[PDB]
Amino acid sequence: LDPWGAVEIKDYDRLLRTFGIRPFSEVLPLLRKAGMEPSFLMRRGIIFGHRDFDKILEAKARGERVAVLTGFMPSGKFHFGHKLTVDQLIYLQKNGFKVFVAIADAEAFAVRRIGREEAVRIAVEEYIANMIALGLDPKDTEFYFQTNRGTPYFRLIQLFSGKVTAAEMEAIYGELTPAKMMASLTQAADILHVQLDEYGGYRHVVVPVGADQDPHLRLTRDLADRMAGVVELERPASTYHKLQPGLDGRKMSSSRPDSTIFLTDPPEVARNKLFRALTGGRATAEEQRRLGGVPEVCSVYHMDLYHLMPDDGEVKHIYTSCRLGKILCGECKQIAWEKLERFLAEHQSRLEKAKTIAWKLVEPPRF
Amino acid sequence: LDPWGAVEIKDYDRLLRTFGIRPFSEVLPLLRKAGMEPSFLMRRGIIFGHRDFDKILEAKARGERVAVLTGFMPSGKFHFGHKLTVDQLIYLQKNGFKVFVAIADAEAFAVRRIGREEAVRIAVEEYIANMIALGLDPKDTEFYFQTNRGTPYFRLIQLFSGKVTAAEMEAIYGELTPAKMMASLTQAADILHVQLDEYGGYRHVVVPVGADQDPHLRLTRDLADRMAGVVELERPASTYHKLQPGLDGRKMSSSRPDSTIFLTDPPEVARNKLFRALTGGRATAEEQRRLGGVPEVCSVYHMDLYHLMPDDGEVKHIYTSCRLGKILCGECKQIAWEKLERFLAEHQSRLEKAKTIAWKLVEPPRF
Ligand code: SF4
Ligand code: SF4
């Protein structure tokens, strides 16, 4: 009777301990002392790990302003993979964190060959505007473009290039083009620059990521240590989330549009994508009733768990019912659909106004 | 009877034509139309080549403001190798060019492992202050640090990283560390950024260099062409000088201090370095009188030709006399010494005041 899936995380939390990644539960008491209750993603163990988030919460409890930072590639449409990250920002923002959102338009240009005008458009109208419509505060959130962030941020990138080898970078990202080399240093600057006085002096910063992104984060923490004597930087903290599988059971992508719901999908389009999702269902109505289903492998159940059913009781009932033989996939899908239809409609009603607001929250680069 | 050494330059001007480098003499008529008389380095064929300097002079003649740009590595002491470059800047500055001088402090840090505080010190008190004492105008010269030059300059570096391959860079500089990769893009930005409106909009820029520096300049001209559609850049022009050999007949270096006169050398120290220089002299006083000497291989004669004797007649007389058997190396050295002693004394009398002025011509970077 395992709705949260504790046994799926004990298996590799052993291996991640090698990199100093800890179970998230060890910060519960610090989370309390900081006056914070866990979010539902924390309760459900979707946020399963942390490194140094205790130090962040210690700073926060003695009254220091603390920050969270993440970046977005302005390519393709905003989807529920992206929403999971923003939802973790909004939680932290409501609990007092300064939020920084980097737009990776330099990487978009140099690595992905995305045009300047288009990167900027997509960043504002697809990324920033969807983030605002989700509930990220337009006033207090600091959005910026990698190509328009200013001298002190770029000076770190210049000085970092002396503190890492080609082999170190190769180990993380593969073949080392000038563009991928630049992107790797710029991403470390995205994390660390908020610690400079020019950007507000936020020494304690947490970055929410998947495990698969830890190698770059470790190179960033090395860069902080290697800058000692030049500029004093703290190693960034991190929280670790399990990635939501796409509706096909493969990785969630704007590329493979059928297995990702976009936040801008019209209701008929989203419903059909949802109804086509892979489930843990069985041969037939008949066989499902005797044995029940397998929520552990069902992308509908993961949509409920990660997004559509914040209420623990309600998503437990789905799990129980499916595991007891009480529910078929057709009805389970329409239940998830009704939650999604309401979410999309309220979100989309906010989006045209968010887009207007968005063009005023940033200075686009001149070229 | 060849004082200028025309036959030493016809030999490889053939090979450099492969790269579109032309004899400098082809710009003489443009130089006239621009209201300019050749400098002595041009007359002597020490400036032997150009690429696209005609386009610069065409812009200048129709009244456009034109620019020259070069960079200096703030490492070690300022020597007569550096003076040859500044002398070409001063000539162009007196003929109306805007001069830009880049300090390579990012490269100094990341590639050469030179500390921040020391790079900055050396740049101001050893490089900028010696340039001012030489006659570079403190008001109209634009000096800057790579690490403090601002957003639009750094954006080029970020966008350039998408337009060059690892193999292209490898071909120019060897093993491709993150630092050497960064330095190569930053050096192209040093040349091209002056064309942006933010730095004055100087589309027509000339860079004075040795032939050995042309591979990087060609990659810079490729980067200009490859940016079409993103930001419109003109291919930079260049003039080409023969390098002055050190007093030992090897390359002139702060590393091998005996074969370079530093502008700050006290008179006794410079005199001795000069008196130890390799000459084209012979076994003995006796054998020199019959045959004469060999100025073509004499580092004393090259000091006269590149610096100490601007007057064509006077340096011709040295050549003639040595080639006629009329002069021994001891007297030739003391003649060159008297010119150098006067030059050093007037230069050094200007230097303490130049250092004061220098700290006001730049904003040093904060870290
Ligand atoms: S009944 Fe629901 S949770 Fe169970 S396998 Fe089907 S879609 Fe998934
Ligand atoms: S006489 Fe002068 S120019 Fe001739 S070889 Fe000696 S030092 Fe050189």
PDB file of C-alpha atoms and ligand atoms in Angstrom, chain A residues 277-282 288 292-302 304 318-319 321-323 326-333 336, ligand 1:
ATOM      1  CA  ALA A 277      -1.279   8.438 -22.450  1.00  0.00           C
ATOM      2  CA  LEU A 278       0.317   5.110 -21.482  1.00  0.00           C
ATOM      3  CA  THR A 279      -1.175   3.594 -18.334  1.00  0.00           C
ATOM      4  CA  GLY A 280      -0.578   0.628 -16.062  1.00  0.00           C
ATOM      5  CA  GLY A 281      -3.946  -0.769 -17.330  1.00  0.00           C
ATOM      6  CA  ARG A 282      -4.497  -4.380 -18.510  1.00  0.00           C
ATOM      7  CA  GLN A 288      -8.442  -5.016 -14.799  1.00  0.00           C
ATOM      8  CA  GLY A 292      -6.439  -3.925 -10.658  1.00  0.00           C
ATOM      9  CA  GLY A 293      -3.843  -1.677 -12.248  1.00  0.00           C
ATOM     10  CA  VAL A 294      -0.240  -0.682 -11.901  1.00  0.00           C
ATOM     11  CA  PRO A 295      -0.011   3.067 -10.901  1.00  0.00           C
ATOM     12  CA  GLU A 296       3.830   2.784 -10.436  1.00  0.00           C
ATOM     13  CA  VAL A 297       4.143   2.662 -14.291  1.00  0.00           C
ATOM     14  CA  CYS A 298       1.155   4.819 -15.265  1.00  0.00           C
ATOM     15  CA  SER A 299       1.718   8.282 -16.719  1.00  0.00           C
ATOM     16  CA  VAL A 300      -1.914   9.295 -15.814  1.00  0.00           C
ATOM     17  CA  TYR A 301      -1.297   8.517 -12.188  1.00  0.00           C
ATOM     18  CA  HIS A 302       1.986  10.485 -12.337  1.00  0.00           C
ATOM     19  CA  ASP A 304      -2.212  13.267 -10.753  1.00  0.00           C
ATOM     20  CA  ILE A 318      -6.881   6.952  -7.033  1.00  0.00           C
ATOM     21  CA  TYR A 319      -3.943   4.694  -6.127  1.00  0.00           C
ATOM     22  CA  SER A 321      -8.958   2.188  -6.166  1.00  0.00           C
ATOM     23  CA  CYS A 322      -6.733   1.262  -9.106  1.00  0.00           C
ATOM     24  CA  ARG A 323      -4.786  -1.187  -6.883  1.00  0.00           C
ATOM     25  CA  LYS A 326     -12.279  -0.483  -8.453  1.00  0.00           C
ATOM     26  CA  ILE A 327     -11.471   1.750 -11.420  1.00  0.00           C
ATOM     27  CA  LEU A 328     -10.841   1.433 -15.155  1.00  0.00           C
ATOM     28  CA  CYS A 329      -8.418   3.625 -17.161  1.00  0.00           C
ATOM     29  CA  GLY A 330     -11.158   5.289 -19.186  1.00  0.00           C
ATOM     30  CA  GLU A 331     -12.773   6.713 -16.049  1.00  0.00           C
ATOM     31  CA  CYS A 332      -9.444   7.432 -14.419  1.00  0.00           C
ATOM     32  CA  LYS A 333      -8.433   9.455 -17.501  1.00  0.00           C
ATOM     33  CA  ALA A 336      -7.637  13.500 -14.488  1.00  0.00           C
TER      34      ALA A 336
HETATM   35  S1  SF4 C   1      -6.890   3.033 -13.376  1.00  0.00           S
HETATM   36 FE1  SF4 C   1      -5.776   5.127 -13.482  1.00  0.00          FE
HETATM   37  S2  SF4 C   1      -3.931   4.890 -12.146  1.00  0.00           S
HETATM   38 FE2  SF4 C   1      -4.747   2.738 -12.605  1.00  0.00          FE
HETATM   39  S3  SF4 C   1      -3.561   2.118 -14.423  1.00  0.00           S
HETATM   40 FE3  SF4 C   1      -5.486   3.060 -15.232  1.00  0.00          FE
HETATM   41  S4  SF4 C   1      -5.015   5.293 -15.591  1.00  0.00           S
HETATM   42 FE4  SF4 C   1      -3.363   4.490 -14.264  1.00  0.00          FE
END
